[PDB]
Amino acid sequence: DRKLWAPGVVAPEYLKGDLAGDYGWDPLGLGADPTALKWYRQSELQHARWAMLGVAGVLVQEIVKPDVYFYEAGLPQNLPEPFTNINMGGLLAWEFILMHWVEVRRWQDYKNFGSVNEDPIFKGNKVPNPEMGYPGGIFDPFGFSKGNLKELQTKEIKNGRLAMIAYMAFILQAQATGKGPLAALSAHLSNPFGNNILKNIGTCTVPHSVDVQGLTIPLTCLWPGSQ
Template identity: 45%
Template structure:
């Protein structure tokens, strides 16, 4: 077979190969198409099981409701809202733990460890501790009441007379859990990418909740920060892991693992 025949055969095989369909461009962006595809192919947390019908339409839905607590639509709306709030708190907490820890290790700052930061702030605060607690209770009560009222009636906090003439600042997106307005300075709740942002937020939030539990467990087991634990593990993976901290497992680690400790 000469070079001409080889070339012809190669081109024929390419032409016969099925081509992947190109994404159709419409008013919705590729991000929106990706979000819809991800929502449809989210799968199930239990392989082979069928997603409950009452969970359909929720972002990042994996059908996880083994106790079927979401069968009541009103209860499901509250659970969804509560999960969002916990996700956001967890993401803020994880960022507040990791960023100072990283900056400490690279020598940019010298900040207290996360489990001790509250006491350091209290000891150095010009406001007496009891006064500070009273102010925080008042502030949290105000925010939680506004959130609860907006949950019961989305958009109600923008109605005239709801907040001494500043109601416009609390005008939300009209959807429970997504306040919009001043809480969305980049306008992410508008446009075709909103559905994709919902999926990203809930997935990152769930990961953050697990991460925070991990940080807490690590400190209780090792009395170290997450970055300290990571550095120790990278230096000696077999000697520094959950089997060797003396807490995670109900039995003592094998002596061979402890011998590997530098």
């Protein structure tokens, strides 16, 4: 909790550096009751890790194949060669089942910490739990744990906050300009005084809807302006 988010401020009573990356920010007072703090820390970790994966996927996909727009990459006509124009319903079903399982298991880890640590089919191998939100074991196979756990946790969560900001930046840059992240960087380095957030806010390249195999997904933007 040292070196807070601002010089002239004080840390809240419920943030004393007990958790990783605590600068004592909480201006909306949401982590006042500890159970809500547990839930919000778990959701932080989830948003953080999924956003790290998100920016990693966008950046890697943009470098290894720039001809695919990540904003439209979810469409089946833009899926890779074995999955092109696949039935999105069965794909959604695969995802739904396979993620309902693991996320209900994670939720039960939240509700009863140390109860779903065991493999429910092969009844010999468990995953330990230093804390909640950090299983380890098969999820930490390279063995980077049993070291500076709090330090790695701070690194994880800080890169994760940064990745959250950066992925929403990717989304907004894709909605405003219609290009990918590094595409946007190269376009800003092509014209750093006429091609920026100026004269791009107010334009949404996102259409009002799409047709993915018969449906009509509403396809909104994060702000109005130019459909």
